[PDB]
Design a protein around this ligand. Sequence first.
Ligand SMILES: CCCCCCCCCCCCCCCCCC(=O)OC[C@H](COP(=O)(O)OCCN)OC(=O)CCCCCCCCCCCCCCCCC
Ligand code: SF4
Ligand code: SF4
Ligand code: SF4
Ligand code: SF4
Ligand code: FES
Ligand SMILES: [K+]
Ligand SMILES: [Zn+2]
Lengths: 206, 114, 125, 114, 94, 231, 95, 176, 263
Amino acid sequence: RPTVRPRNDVAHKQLSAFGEYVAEILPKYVQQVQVSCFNELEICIHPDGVIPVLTFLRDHSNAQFKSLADLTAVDIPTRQNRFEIVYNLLSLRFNSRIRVKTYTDELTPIESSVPVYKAANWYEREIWDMFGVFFANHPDLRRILTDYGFEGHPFRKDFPLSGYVELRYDDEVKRVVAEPVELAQEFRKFDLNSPWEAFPAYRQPP
Amino acid sequence: GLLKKTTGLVGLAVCETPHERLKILYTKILDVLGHIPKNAAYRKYTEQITNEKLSMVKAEPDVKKLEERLQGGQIEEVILQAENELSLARKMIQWKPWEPLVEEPPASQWKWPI
Amino acid sequence: QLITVDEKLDITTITGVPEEHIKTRKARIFVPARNNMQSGVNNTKKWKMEFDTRERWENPLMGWASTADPLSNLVLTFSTKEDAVAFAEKNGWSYDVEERKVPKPKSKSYGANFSWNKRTRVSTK
Amino acid sequence: TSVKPIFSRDMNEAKRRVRELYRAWYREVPNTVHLFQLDISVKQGRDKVREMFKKNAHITDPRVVDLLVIKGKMELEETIKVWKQRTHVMRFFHETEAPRPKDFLSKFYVGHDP
Amino acid sequence: ASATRFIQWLRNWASGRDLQAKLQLRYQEISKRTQPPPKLPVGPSHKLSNNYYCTRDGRREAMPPSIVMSSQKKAVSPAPPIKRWELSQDEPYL
Amino acid sequence: HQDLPLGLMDDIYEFSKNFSLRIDELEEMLTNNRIWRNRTVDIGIVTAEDALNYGFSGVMLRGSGIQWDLRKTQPYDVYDQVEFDVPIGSRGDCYDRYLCRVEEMRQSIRIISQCLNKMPPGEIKVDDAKVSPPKRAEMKTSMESLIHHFKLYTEGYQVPPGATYTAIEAPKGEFGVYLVSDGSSRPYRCKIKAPGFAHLAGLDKMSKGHMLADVVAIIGTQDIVFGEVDR
Amino acid sequence: GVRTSPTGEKVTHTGQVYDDGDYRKVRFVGRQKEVNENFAIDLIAEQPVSQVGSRVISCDGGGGALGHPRVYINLDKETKTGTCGYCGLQFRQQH
Amino acid sequence: TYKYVNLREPSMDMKSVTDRAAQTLLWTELIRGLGMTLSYLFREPATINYPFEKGPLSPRFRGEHALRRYPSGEERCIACKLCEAVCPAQAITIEAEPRADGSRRTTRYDIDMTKCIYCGFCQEACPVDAIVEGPNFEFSTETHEELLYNKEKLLNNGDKWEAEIAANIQADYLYR
Amino acid sequence: SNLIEVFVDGQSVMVEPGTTVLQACEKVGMQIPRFCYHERLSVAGNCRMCLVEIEKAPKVVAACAMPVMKGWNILTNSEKTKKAREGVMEFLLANHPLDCPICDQGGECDLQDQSMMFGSDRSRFLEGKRAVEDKNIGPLVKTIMTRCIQCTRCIRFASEIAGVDDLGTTGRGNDMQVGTYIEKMFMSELSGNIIDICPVGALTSKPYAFTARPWETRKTESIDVMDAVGSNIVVSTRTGEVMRILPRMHEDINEEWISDKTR
Ligand SMILES: CCCCCCCCCCCCCCCCCC(=O)OC[C@H](COP(=O)(O)OCCN)OC(=O)CCCCCCCCCCCCCCCCC
Ligand code: SF4
Ligand code: SF4
Ligand code: SF4
Ligand code: SF4
Ligand code: FES
Ligand SMILES: [K+]
Ligand SMILES: [Zn+2]
């Protein structure tokens, strides 16, 4: 079928088998395992298990996920633990990828994974900067992307797109100053969602 | 069985006695694994793959043919992976991840879309 | 090792929001009304949180709509009103909660269109 | 209601960190005024430090206090290492911002906001 | 292309290459800036029958993830080990 | 978005036919120049293990001998149908990474030559008008096409809920997006994995034991564009 | 169809013009008010009505795929003409 | 498949060692580098004589915006707002009302040229070929305000450039 | 006791006798596509967009009108159901005018949206289209009747809700036309509600004509003050300006209607 993405059952079965393998070996930490219809494996864990689970996947002979592809956060305000912490890992030995997910809120530290991957250093600084998730035992946790003295965590869903302050050069004080934001043209919010359901397969129970 | 000049990976030295090094390492792993409960999946699975690797090492004196059996790259990569497993096994004893789940997630923690 | 905290969760001091946009705002927690121009109901499933509307004025140069309200476009989505209320409380916003309106079950009967002695009989089809 | 702490296990431990941070800021102001060639006085800088601390005096959650101290230490580091420029230090003082009126009548005359 | 024979010889010798065969300035070998109109083909879904969208609706064949374990035998790797690369036969060494 | 205009492929062929000579002239200036070698040889050496654990990708890996290239190992659109070689370093230094990049240019021309010859006929966007807009001539004659055009350019297509980490072998290394769909026509979250982010994070490590002027060379060897580092 | 106001300012095709006390016209002092003088309302009115022999006619604005979406215009009423909603051309059923 | 870029053993015979000593002492590879820059001195440069000569462009080129008309002079734009909806930068602002003759037309059509990313999405979205990106790229200004285009400016651009815009559309519309 | 068990895609649901198939589906969160059906009007069953397969039954049923029987399994997503929807949508769009850019319904149109969700993605109609003359029914409701899909919602609303029997259908077959036959104005204090219930841009607000698109409006839920009923409304605004007033459903006050003064 020319327009439809072909399925890959063989990879789906392999990744499912490995997902059970991980769950059996680390029952203390694994809460959910799932494989998407495009064959990506996700391990959902208790936050206490960040270091043991990541170490296992890096070092175990049947895993060897030696490369941390990416580390990021997602803000979901409706959840009690609004922040989802996503680790994307790559195994060159087995030419495979795995995603490890955990959660935290605004006041609960997550264990820094710099001991497992040195790559994690800056990714965790960015998560702290943009989302305000604190990582315990980080060698140097501080803002990385925002301005010095910037207040707030911009990537949170309740942070306004245009922020609270804006900058200009003021001649009286002969320096750049920060003042409350005023826009000559307000950003125009669009309501795009169709009132008609698009995907029956994902309908939620009433 | 001539000794190769280079592994081709920067920082990974050539190993002069790969068979002895691997026999020592795999035996060490099985020793550390004896301290893990018998019904822990980490022990059962790691003992199984370790023993298979140890049998290959004993059944192949040719390094290049041994490398092909193990499918782990250079024999020096295989030695490094064994050292990683030995280090992991010692961490697992302290972590004890075979214990029951510490805590269930809140009700809708892994529900997507919301 | 865990500790015990009994304080009501309050994060207003660590979110960076200017004080004006916490104390003087009124969050509205509600399920959006169905757009009456369409019959689809898929936009009435989730809870929303929006803030009070503030001044928009005409830009002298172009006539564009200008604003000084940083929350003018902020709209948050929640699975339940309890989640929305919890989010509002910990952020220090005062809020109003409007109970979800659900269309009541109707009694429909095609046969009633042809009633022998009731007013429901239709004069045209 | 049992939670993972950040640094402090209770308010008494948390308030020790607050006092330590205040001392560090208090001693840093004279250097900051000289290093950034600020036109404010050392007393003004310390009066501003006290004002920033004082507005958070109502917090009773040790985890919130820990984050405030954590963020306060980051801000102090940015100042001591001169990662901030003069504009950043002076942003605490809102020199170019006109006095916002507070009483009901003044706000009524200018606009609609409360 | 306008270089004299002497100057062409001088620069060919200095560089060591036959520069004139591969000039970096374009001349008449480029395609015309006016071209005949195209007539592009149409895709596989351009049919008048046997073409119901529900038989070619990729988006609606997407499914939620398969939950293999929820908190509510031989060892396996995530995939078979990767095969050793083979040295190029075009030119193994620079 | 559109098909190739008539005559473009001929001009790409004309450009490609002469380009390897331009690389040769570049190599005459640098490859054997003792000053260039002094500035790059044994500068910014990274071991294979450190490169992996620091999150490096692309030439930052292959320069140190790691045999990895997503076009080969995790191929996309049609990379499995073209032939090319992956250049590999042996010293893990700036000079080897320079050589890898120069050789990759040669292999890129080799791929381009195959794409020109094996270019097939057909449409250039999915024949599915709930995703790709219809042709303008159809939009102006058929009711279905006009509705789909109107909706695709106002609401956009809805994407089924889910999350993917997708990566390619970009010129600077592995470039990926962790894209989260909530079922609507707007993405819920889009994290951009930029290879230069991890690479620049490794500058302090790579600059150990080097002089100030070597920091310029190491930054260059990493090939850093702050559009993607900072996003 | 450019007309001017008592103050002298040209009136645009959307009817815009600053009134007498409007300070905003200071922007034109020493410069000029850009006004397009080809008023489309006056130009389309110059087009003749097209006589046709059917109750229904189709318009695509001319030029095939270079015009507008093709629409069908009903010409049953004799009081008025049929006007294309896209391009403003008019049609009339003859006899 | 892979290749090694820098994995070779130098020959250690006397002839080869003496070759490298001569290179070290006589700077031969450096002299060879001088040869290449010498050959470029005697090549014709690639510079064109701007503004008397111009770089080549194609009919698809995305430049300054313009609003187009029908042959009768009627505006093509019918205020559908598809362009405004698609604009990735929110650079377009539109108001509309019934015209005095009942026509559906705009009363405001603004493009902030300093918000615009010159992406061309507006001209793809337009159902009537009303808004286009024209061929002009030489419209830099001395003030910011001059780059905030209203409808009169954009209609004037269309009347100014229509001769070239129509020909360019004539060359590319079969690829659209 | 009184309730009977039916199944919606295998999911059991208990419904009262007389419940239609469409209402049973809505009990499990599935909205059957519709055009002629409106829950506050009498059932018509003419658009046929609601056709749905009943397991082990060879003929699709009009879900809006068919009473559900005990033990039925309603397959709302079967191949037979999808092909029925595609076919009906194809007939609906065959004579429909290519008006979306100039049509005020665009962006909040049930024909557009259900075409996207349930119809095919292209046309195979190779003929010329129908064109219908417009009717003048007063200064509030603009008629562009070539867009009408003959759903008869307006007729049923006028007769049953407004108690005015002025709207009907004349002619037959493909030439059937909704209107008043004679020149006549639909001036009732509830007349403007036919704009809302008309699924297409056949009936549109004259004062609102051309001024806005739905996606750019901001919706402020509010209350009416034109009388003492207290009808719930939505105030649509754009860039600081009020653009129109819409009903906001409230079962215990105005349901989903408003008076013309409120509107
Ligand atoms: C019979 C009895 C006779 C006894 C006497 C016999 C003597 C003849 C035999 C000896 C020949 C002596 C050569 C003298 C030139 C200097 C040689 C030299 O110093 O070269 C080595 C120098 C550094 O070499 P390097 O690659 O860095 O490695 C060495 C460190 N391990 O490398 C360099 O210096 C490179 C230069 C760097 C500058 C590059 C820019 C200049 C390049 C263009 C120069 C053009 C030639 C100059 C001509 C000038 C004419 C006025
Ligand atoms: S070119 Fe792109 S950014 Fe500019 S107005 Fe058109 S759609 Fe908007
Ligand atoms: S320029 Fe085109 S797309 Fe934009 S409002 Fe006018 S007709 Fe619609
Ligand atoms: S009623 Fe809907 S489908 Fe018909 S022209 Fe209007 S917007 Fe398009
Ligand atoms: S005018 Fe509208 S409501 Fe009335 S029959 Fe036609 S489509 Fe239905
Ligand atoms: S909704 Fe059932 S036939 Fe119209
Ligand atoms: K309507
Ligand atoms: Zn027309």
